[PDB]
Structures are given as C-alpha cells and as structure tokens.
Scaffold this active site. Structure first.
Site, PDB file in Angstrom:
ATOM      1  N   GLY A   1       0.830  -1.208   0.000  1.00 29.00           N
ATOM      2  CA  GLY A   1       0.000   0.000   0.000  1.00 29.00           C
ATOM      3  C   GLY A   1       0.860   1.252   0.000  1.00 29.00           C
ATOM      4  O   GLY A   1       0.551   2.235  -0.679  1.00 29.00           O
TER       5      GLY A   1
ATOM      6  N   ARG B   1       7.292   1.614   1.190  1.00 26.49           N
ATOM      7  CA  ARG B   1       7.545   0.188   1.346  1.00 26.49           C
ATOM      8  C   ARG B   1       7.864  -0.471   0.008  1.00 26.49           C
ATOM      9  O   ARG B   1       8.640  -1.431  -0.040  1.00 26.49           O
ATOM     10  CB  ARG B   1       6.411  -0.527   2.080  1.00 26.49           C
ATOM     11  CG  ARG B   1       6.322  -0.115   3.537  1.00 26.49           C
ATOM     12  CD  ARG B   1       5.896  -1.259   4.434  1.00 26.49           C
ATOM     13  NE  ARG B   1       5.010  -0.800   5.502  1.00 26.49           N
ATOM     14  CZ  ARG B   1       3.694  -1.002   5.520  1.00 26.49           C
ATOM     15  NH1 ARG B   1       3.108  -1.676   4.536  1.00 26.49           N
ATOM     16  NH2 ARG B   1       2.956  -0.548   6.525  1.00 26.49           N
TER      17      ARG B   1
ATOM     18  N   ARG C   1       2.279  11.069  -8.752  1.00 25.41           N
ATOM     19  CA  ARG C   1       1.616  11.138  -7.451  1.00 25.41           C
ATOM     20  C   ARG C   1       2.436  10.509  -6.318  1.00 25.41           C
ATOM     21  O   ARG C   1       1.870  10.049  -5.313  1.00 25.41           O
ATOM     22  CB  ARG C   1       0.213  10.522  -7.516  1.00 25.41           C
ATOM     23  CG  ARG C   1      -0.725  11.203  -8.508  1.00 25.41           C
ATOM     24  CD  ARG C   1      -2.093  10.528  -8.549  1.00 25.41           C
ATOM     25  NE  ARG C   1      -3.008  11.276  -9.406  1.00 25.41           N
ATOM     26  CZ  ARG C   1      -3.969  12.091  -8.978  1.00 25.41           C
ATOM     27  NH1 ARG C   1      -4.187  12.268  -7.675  1.00 25.41           N
ATOM     28  NH2 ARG C   1      -4.728  12.727  -9.865  1.00 25.41           N
TER      29      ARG C   1
ATOM     30  N   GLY D   1       1.323  -6.581   2.863  1.00 25.35           N
ATOM     31  CA  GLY D   1       0.915  -5.483   3.722  1.00 25.35           C
ATOM     32  C   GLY D   1       0.740  -5.891   5.164  1.00 25.35           C
ATOM     33  O   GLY D   1       1.110  -7.001   5.560  1.00 25.35           O
ATOM     34  N   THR D   2       0.182  -4.974   5.943  1.00 25.87           N
ATOM     35  CA  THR D   2      -0.053  -5.176   7.363  1.00 25.87           C
ATOM     36  C   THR D   2      -1.556  -5.174   7.614  1.00 25.87           C
ATOM     37  O   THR D   2      -2.343  -4.760   6.764  1.00 25.87           O
ATOM     38  CB  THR D   2       0.629  -4.086   8.225  1.00 25.87           C
ATOM     39  OG1 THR D   2       0.212  -2.787   7.783  1.00 25.87           O
ATOM     40  CG2 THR D   2       2.155  -4.183   8.131  1.00 25.87           C
TER      41      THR D   2
ATOM     42  N   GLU E   1      -7.900  -5.154   6.817  1.00 19.04           N
ATOM     43  CA  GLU E   1      -7.028  -4.316   6.006  1.00 19.04           C
ATOM     44  C   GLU E   1      -7.946  -3.601   5.011  1.00 19.04           C
ATOM     45  O   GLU E   1      -9.162  -3.553   5.236  1.00 19.04           O
ATOM     46  CB  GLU E   1      -5.938  -5.152   5.334  1.00 19.04           C
ATOM     47  CG  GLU E   1      -6.449  -6.398   4.630  1.00 19.04           C
ATOM     48  CD  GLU E   1      -6.941  -6.096   3.236  1.00 19.04           C
ATOM     49  OE1 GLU E   1      -8.167  -6.184   3.012  1.00 19.04           O
ATOM     50  OE2 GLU E   1      -6.102  -5.745   2.376  1.00 19.04           O
TER      51      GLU E   1
ATOM     52  N   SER F   1       0.436  -6.272  12.497  1.00 10.07           N
ATOM     53  CA  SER F   1       1.198  -5.214  13.157  1.00 10.07           C
ATOM     54  C   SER F   1       0.454  -4.665  14.367  1.00 10.07           C
ATOM     55  O   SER F   1       1.068  -4.087  15.263  1.00 10.07           O
ATOM     56  CB  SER F   1       1.499  -4.079  12.181  1.00 10.07           C
ATOM     57  OG  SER F   1       0.301  -3.537  11.660  1.00 10.07           O
ATOM     58  N   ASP F   2      -0.868  -4.838  14.377  1.00 10.94           N
ATOM     59  CA  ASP F   2      -1.731  -4.315  15.432  1.00 10.94           C
ATOM     60  C   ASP F   2      -2.773  -5.340  15.839  1.00 10.94           C
ATOM     61  O   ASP F   2      -3.282  -6.098  15.008  1.00 10.94           O
ATOM     62  CB  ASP F   2      -2.463  -3.061  14.958  1.00 10.94           C
ATOM     63  CG  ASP F   2      -1.536  -1.896  14.721  1.00 10.94           C
ATOM     64  OD1 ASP F   2      -0.825  -1.499  15.669  1.00 10.94           O
ATOM     65  OD2 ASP F   2      -1.526  -1.370  13.588  1.00 10.94           O
TER      66      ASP F   2
END
Ligand SMILES: [Mg+2]
Ligand SMILES: [Mg+2]
Lengths: 231, 231, 231, 231, 231, 231
Positions: free
Chosen positions: C19, C23, C42, C88-89, C178, C202-203
C-alpha cells in the site's frame, strides 16, 4: 391532464408551490395582482396573477413526494413551467435553529424510494438551482431575516414508530424536516428546469415549541416576499 | 497518529486538500510564504505556510473516499482543522461544461457505501458549507472565470465495466466526476466543521478531449487563488 | 496511463503490491537485484528489478479499494501483469491471532459497494488464486512462521463511529482487517489473472497491542521472502 | 431435536453431507463398516459406521440452504459434529470445466439472503476450512483426478426466470453452481467447526452436455474416497 | 424431469403439498382411494389416487422455498398441475392463536431473496387464490374448527441467531411462521395457476407450548379433510 | 391535530376513505343522512352522517402513501376509527380486467420505502381484513357486478420514465395500480384495526381505454353501496 384542468397557457413559467391549496389562495389574494383561479380538481387550488408586471402562478401540491411529483410533472411537462419555488413550513431538528427561522434548502435528503428505484443503491443528491438559492439568500439578508442555508430532510413519514426519529440526520447537519423538496429537486433536474425550496420554521421538533398563529402569518408573508423577489 | 506524523500545532486550521501529494508540494512552494513540510509518511506530503499573514496548510489525500477519509479524520480530530477546501481535477460529463471550466461542488453524489452503511438505504445528501461555496463563486466571478455550481459524482470506480457509465448521472444534472468530495462533505458535517470542493475540468468524458499540460497549470493556479481567497 | 507513466516493457509480469510507496522502495532496494524506478506520478513509486534471474516489479497502490483498483487495473490492462501479490499489514480481530502472525487471505469480505453495484444484492466471494495460496502457505511452514489461512475484511472505513466495529466479523471467523484485498481479488478474477494477499499482524484490535518498529521490520522481511518464493 | 431423532452419541464427529438421503444410503452401504441407520424422520436418512478405525456418519441434507441449515445446525449443536464434508454434484458454468471434473469449493458465492440479513448489505465471504481444502486437493492430485479449486455459487433457484442466468458469475471466475455450500460454510464459521464442500460435475450448463448414469456412479465413487481420506 | 421421475399423466391437476414425504404417504394411505406411488427420487414420495370421483395427487416438497420451488415448478410446468394446496404445521407468534388452531394464509411475508432478486427492492405480496381461500374458510366454519385468516411468514431460517426473532412480524399482525408459502404463492402467480396454504398450529413460539402426538394427528386429519373439500 | 381540526366525537368509528376530498363531499351528500362537515384544513373535507341508523364518516386522504398515512394515523390514534374502507379508482394492468370492473384488494404490493425502512430488506405483505374482503365480495356478487379479488400495486410514481412500467407486476398476477392501499393495510395492521380497499377500473393501462364521466359515476355509486353494506 388528469389533475390540473386548465388551458395550456393559463399557468405562468414562474410558480410558487405551497403544499396547502388554501395557502395558494392566500398567496394569490394577498401578493398578486388580478389573481385568476385556473384549477379546482381535488380542491387543489392554482392561480395565475402578476407581480411587478410579470406573470406568477401559485399551485398547491398536497403533502408528500408522490402527490407533489404529480403536480410538478404536469406543470413542467404540460404547462411549460421553468422556475419552481416551493414555499412551506418545516420542523426544526437542531437547537441551532429557532422558531420563525427561514431555511433555504441547498439540498434535500430523503427516506423516499424515489431515487433508490432509479439509481439502484447509489446515492443521488437532489439540489437547489444555485442562482435561485443565492438570490433568496441575499433577499433574506437585505431584510435582516434569520436565515440558514443547508440540508433538509424530505420524509415519507410524518408520524414515527419510535422517538428521536431524526437524531442521526441532525448529527449529520440536517436542519429541518418537511415532505416535498427531494421530489421537486429530483424532477427539476430530470426536466432541466430550475427549482428552489424555501421554508419557515413553524415547529421545533427538539424543544417541543410551536409558533402562535399570528407569528406564522408574519414570517410566512416575509417568506413569500423573498420568494417573489427570487424569481 | 498512524498516517500524519507531526506535532499537534504544526497544521493550520485552514487547509487545502489536493489528491496528489506532489500538487500539495507545488501549492506550498508557489503560493505560500515560508512553507514548512510537516509530513512525509507514505509520501503523502503536507506543508504549513502563510497567506496574507495567516497560516494555511496543504495536505495530499490520495485517491478515493477511503484514503481521503483517513487524512480528513486525522486533520479534524487530531490536528483541529476547521476549514477544509479540496482543490482537484474532475472529468466533465456534460457538453454544457468545457475544458478548463471551474466546478464548485454544491453537493456530491456517490456510488460509495459510506452512507448506505450508516443511513441504511435512506438518502443522505453530502453538501458544501454555503458560506464557503458563496465566496468561492464570487471570487471566481470577479476574475471572469467560467464557473459552474452544482452536483458532482464521487465514484469508487475510475475504470468502468461498460461504456456510458455516467449517462444516468448526467441526465440528472450531475456536472463532473471525481473521487473524494462525498467523503469530505460527509465527515465535515459529522464533525461540525466547514468544507468545500473546487475542481478544474481537465478531461471531458463525453467529447474525449483532454487539456494540454500548460493549460492545466494555468487554470490550476487560478483555482488555487480562488481557494486561498475563499478562506 | 494517467497514474503510471512508464513504457509497457518497464513492468514485470510478476508484481508485489504494498500500500505504501515507501515500502515499495524498501522492498526493491533490499530484495531485488538492480532495482530501477519506473513511476513517480503522485509519489506512487514503482520499481522493476530481478529475483533469482527473473524480473519482479513492486508498485505502491495507496490505501483503500478505489486507489488500489486504479493501479491494479492499469497494471493488468496496460502493462500485462499476471501474478499480483499484495504484501501489507493488518489489524487482528481475534485473540487466536497474535502480533507478528502471518495471515494469508483465502478470501476477502468487504463493506465496499464494489460488488453490490455489480451483482445487485447477491453475494460474490472474492478469493485468492489457490495455487499461490498453497505455495505461500508451504513457504511459511518451511520457515516455522506462525501462519493462518482464512478470511480478512477489506474495509472502506479505517476510523469507526462506534466501538467494537469488528465483532460480528470475528464471530464469523474473520481473522484480520485491512483495506485492499477484496478489490485485488475481484479484479484479478474479472481479468483472469492470478492474485494473493499476504499480511503481517502489526496491530491487535482486540488487545490494543502494537508492535515495535524493529519487530514489524523483521517479520515484514520474512513476508517479502515468502512472497518472492511464491511467484 | 425435532428433525433428527437419535440419541446423543449415535452421530460421529466427522460426517459426510449428501443432499440426497438415498445417496447417504449408498455411501453407508458401500464405504462404511457396519452402517447403522440412526434417523428416518422425514425420510432423511442418517447413518453411522466406521472407516479405517474411526467412526464416520453420513446424513442427507435435502436441497437448499434453508433445508441444509436445519440439519447442519442440529448436527453441530445437538450431536457434536466437528468436521462436515458436503459431497454433491454441480452444474459447470465455464467451458474450462469438463464433465466429471472434481470441484473443491474454496468459497461459496450466493443469491440467498442468509448473510444479507445478518451483515445488512456488507459482503461476507463463506469459505472452506483451509486444512480440509488442502488435504482434499492432495488426495485428488495423487489419484490423478481432474480437479479445480475455486468459487462455486450456492443458488436458491434451480429453475430460472430468464436464460444465461450464470453469465455474470462465470465472468468473475465462478466454476459451478449448486445449492448448499454457502449455508454450510457460514454455519461452520458461526459455530467454530470445520467444513468442506466437494462436488463432481454431472451437468455442463454451458455446453448442455450430461453424464451417463455409469459415469455418475464412477466419479461419485472417487469423490467419496477423497472425502473419507480428507476427513 | 430430474426431481420427479414419473410419466406425464401420473400426476393429477389437483395436488396436496406436505413438506414431509412421509406425511404424503400418510395422506395417500388414509384419504385417497387406490393410492399409487409415482415417485421415489430422493425419498420424496409422490402419490396419485382418487377422492369422491376425481383424481388427487399428494407430493412431498421438502423444507424451504428453494426445495419446494423445485417440486412446484416441475409439478406445474412438466406435469400440468393447476390447483396446489400446501398442508403443513406452523409456529404461532401471537397469543391470539392457541395450539391446534387452523391458519389459512391469505398472503405470505418472507425473509427469502426470492422476490428481492426479481423486483429489485420493490415489494411484491405473494397471495392465495381468493376462491380457494374462501372455500377453505367455509369448510372450516361448518366443521366448527377454530380458524384464522391472515398473514404468515415464510422464513429461510428455522434456528435464529438471536431471541424474539418474530417480534416485529407479530406487531404487524403476522399470525404464524413456516417455510414454503411465499414460494408457492409466487410461483403459482408466475405460472397462472391456483394455490392455497393451510396450516395447523403445532407449536406456540410465544408461550413455549407444544401439542401432544395425539393432538397433532387429530387436527391434522381435520386439515386434510378441509383441503380435499377445498380442492 | 395539525391536519384534521375536529373534536374527538365528530368522527365515526366506521369511515370511508376516498383520495379526492370532492369525492368525500359527493359520497356524504348522496349516500349519508344528515351529512355534516367536520374538517376543512388544507381543503381535505371530512364528513359525518348516518347510514341505516349508524354513524359513518367520509374523509379525503389525498394522493400517495405519505399523505394518506397522515390522515389514517390521525383517524385511528386521535379519533378512534376502527373500520377503514378506501374507495377509489385504479388503472388496470391486465387484459383480463375490463373498464368498470370492481377490484377488491386482498393485498397490496408497493414501490414505496414504507416497509423496507421497517423490515430492512425482508418482505412484509400488507393485507385486507379478511372479514371485510369476504363481505364486500358477497355484496358485489349480490349485485351481479364484475368483481376481482387479488393484488394491486400501490405506487409512489404516477408518471413513469419508461414505457411498460407495470409488465413485471402483471406477469405476477397484479390486477391494477393505485397509490394508497399498501399504506392503509400496513397502518391498520400496526394499529390492530380493520381495513379494506375497493376500487373501480376507470382506466386501462394496457388498452389505453378510458371511461366516460357518466360511466364512472354509475359504477362508482355501486362501489359506495358495496362499501356501506360492508361496514
Ligand atoms: Mg521459487
Ligand atoms: Mg349492513
């Protein structure tokens, strides 16, 4: 037409749209020169008169989107109306508004299926014609009237199941509740004509307050004056 | 905050919201005095500078309602932003609009589920703060810019299944398509803050035309000037 | 394309999809040979390099289904990508999952309108390409990594109104939250290409726990290794 | 329990779930050691016997999510079943599948309201337990059987109002249609137990081909073997 | 016809429809002259015999709209059935109904997607053929049986996620719950044929009472008599 | 009440409900003894008189569910009305019906959101009180009147976008279109009172035929007679 029985040139291109046919009578008699009735079907009074040398009509719509849609369709598609200004009452749903406040509906939320049917779960925002909105606002300003420009709710349901029916709407900035504007704004856009809804706060749905009869007439008249100068 | 890493007083209460973080850089560098970067997380540039002795911030939001909602939430709830003006590009969906036209979004239709989730099949109309709308319009007027005030569509889907994806919307008066305004208008209302979306027509989705690079910058700059004078 | 400015040969058939474009940078610099940037539009970095003698690209998608669909659509339709792996996370919504667990998304639930718009109220289940899912699971096994294969929720809404917004999902076996996988899975099926979403916890959204920067780096690296071996 | 009248304990933890009660009879008479009929209520045959040293049950579910849900609920909540494998036939909706192909449902799409009612227009993806999916696939692989792993559709509607009713599903990669899987996967997740749906292609809804009765018995035998080994 | 394997002509124009195939057996063995079993496929017994000089058939439907729909469709489209009377049990959801009351379904509410799919969120009311409703009521009246005519709910869900799941239905006057009526009434209307659903209260979902097995047989006998006389 | 200004004793328990207040006037003057006006608010006439020694009221409701719900709610909750009979006209949507046929609404379909709002996507069938329906049918029989008992559609939308807006409804056995019955039937059930809707076919929406003023008067009178005898 099944609902308005008048010859094709009897209705002016600019028209005020109270819900109550008797208010149409009241408006025609008190604010227009040479008001002539053009319709009586279903007791739904419509009149044509003049304001500053220009023709203005005034037609009752009845209550709710299905009723008003009928008249609006006929007015625009059969009678050639181009500028449609609804003048009505609303119930305030925020304490930030006071009784006798004027509300000019920038847009109209709804619980009607009118647009769900057509946009199938997508969200269409019915809006006022900006030029008309801007004019009404400056007219109201020049008169020092307490006026708010923003969202109203057009509901199908006057009487609710449970209490606090308008809490979510208010939490999202909706100012007041009435029953027609979403229908008017949608059809005006579909037909490529110009529309505006102006409202007077008669009831406060949070504080429980209601205006006295004389107080209504006084601010109602002001609203009509704004509407007429907005054309 | 997970997405904006800046100390609590680094962001001004008035903030411009381009989608493209590089346009944020561009705006900060070309229109603000003493622009200082306050955020770089995910390359999503945000800056604070001054305009006529007042602090203005500029923060990229990314594309689409879910991305912009993240930044808007953080800006309002963590950084105390009160006046949020999105400045962006849109694709025209009516021939009545021309390339380089300015569109000021009175309201924002959407195909997002953002409000369906919350209002459960009722229709909420996300709207601009009238005072901001009115100001932008008069600013654009004074400069003789071709400007239109009305409906935009905030879509989740840049690339469509089938052709003529915007035909129904246009038939109902929608002017242009972008991807953020419905999210901004909804959250601004939920939080009780003030918001506006201003757009430049870069692509015409009906005529197929696209503006040249230099033509974009020229009208983009005008839009920024309007936005800054609208604060 | 409006969003990725590179010649058609610059992007590899096999691509990793974080995302965060930073990264993307991290992945490319630390895991690919001869990484070369092909996109800056962008600030959404994309790189192409080699892994074990074969070309691999890495492209930031931004946050949310609408942003990621733009990139995915362009990668598949304009650049000929055939194997797309989101890395991703995610936030865990069940106590069974622990911080630093690897989650491989067998399918993705969503609160996005993406498929409602398409299947009009019927239920489509966006799924991973089984062959990739199976290979990724074996790669994780072979490293002794704590790994779960199952449902994730792709949400439009990072910040929620009410507390416990995920409990119904969890009650129905959903592992983590996510913001992209449902989009990736739906588009990959639409276009007949191959996709997978691998995530690191991660959380924890139940215990409120969070990982140190060192902790997420180490397990993140392991995930990248899994993804690269899955190609 | 109204729909299954058997003492607790007469039903094994591991159970096969044909739609047809007579196919249950066939399974118990041909694959299980010492099959014992434990239920006759509504002609919905249920058996318990042994396979390679462990008890295995087989229960007819009837056709459709509402019917299967009844049996699945009672089996799980009243009898203590933990591993539930549906075995059935399906109609192929893509030419990629040939008659007699084996399909293992990774997830199940649906046109039932089962989850709409529960998730109010959010999208929940009903999935197989990965461990069973993985074991079933390996069993099919080593037998050299043509096997596909992907989406199936669990429909409420055998006979359709119009032609080509599966065209949109097929375009989004759905392999085959049956009538129960989504209910099974949803209830299994709700109850915290394990489930898989395995299907053989008896009909091709695109080419209009059908298998002979001999071909049905043959490939059906292979399926049961896979299921018993998966269990 | 896959689900009923009988020659054309083996099924009479007039047919009773229990959910339970064994109740079909009971009906044919106890009320019809020279009952002949015409179908064994999936243990779903179907019989034809005679009643007072006319052929009458009796066919098990299984449980749920998707199951019953299959049989109803084949009966009507393949076998030429014209008068279809469902006979069944229901759970009473109002204390106005006592156990063993007869309910004749004037219309059938539903939580199935059967019509939502077809009418896309518009509301279609599935109704009984008035002539059969009228005749059934008069039959019950002259037998002195306690009888109610009103709404039933055809649910997809026997076992509910939460308690008091029928509270809203009961507040809007719904009498009882079963699982098939709405499918029967919808398909009958679609096909231009005649239908009725008659039910006896075997369970009271409010008081938690149940009938004894002797009471069930007794009032069930009365129901069949009413149905045969209605037919 | 805001909409009916009369003391609580002025309105009878049994009330007829035309849409047109001028038809309220016609009914009262021509069919009731000693008719006395009790309401003039918004020109929505209501009268109370006697029929065969018993009090009967007649109240205009206006057009559409939202207008009629206002009156119905007030009549039931503020005035104690218990028997409410809508008498009105309708457009036939099937060739089986002929102009001047009487239609008795057994149930009412709708495209209104009234029940969707309430039952959130489940299907509630608004129905007539069976006892009234049965009595009205017998009254019509006894006069040799061509009469049909079945479904009507209560629409929000008099004027339709596309041609053939009613063909799906007709394909499902719906007889005629009007604008109020679903509202009446839903509210009567909500409040536990008794209701019926009787209609005369004044227009055929398939053949495009229309009745003369004399023709609708004569069959209208007959309908009133039926309604009065049904009380
Ligand atoms: Mg490798
Ligand atoms: Mg009488």
């Amino acid at each position: 037409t099944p609902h308005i029985s008048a010859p094709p040139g009897a209705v002016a291109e600019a028209i005020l749209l109270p819900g109550d046919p008797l208010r149409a009578k009241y408006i025609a008699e008190n604010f227009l020169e040479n008001p002539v009735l053009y319709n009586q079907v279903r007791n739904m009074f419509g009149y044509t008169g003049t304001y500053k040398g220009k023709r203005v009509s005034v037609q009752g719509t009845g209550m709710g989107i299905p009723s008003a849609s009928i008249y609006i369709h006929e007015l625009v598609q059969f009678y050639g109306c181009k500028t449609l200004i609804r003048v009505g009452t609303a119930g305030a749903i925020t304490e930030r508004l006071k009784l006798r406040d004027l509300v000019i509906a920038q847009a109209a939320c709804t619980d009607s299926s009118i647009n769900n049917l057509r946009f199938a779960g997508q969200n269409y925002a019915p809006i006022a014609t900006f030029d008309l909105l801007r004019r009404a606002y400056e007219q109201a300003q020049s008169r020092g009237m307490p006026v708010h420009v923003g969202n109203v709710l057009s509901t199908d349901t006057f009487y609710h199941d449970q209490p606090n029916p308008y809490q979510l709407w208010a939490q999202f900035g909706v100012l007041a509740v009435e029953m027609e504007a979403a229908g008017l704004y949608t059809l005006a856009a579909k037909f490529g004509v110009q529309a505006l809804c102006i409202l007077t706060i008669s009831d406060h749905l949070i504080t429980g307050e209601k205006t006295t009869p004389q107080e209504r007439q006084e601010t109602f008249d002001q609203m009509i004056e704004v509407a007429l100068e907005t054309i």
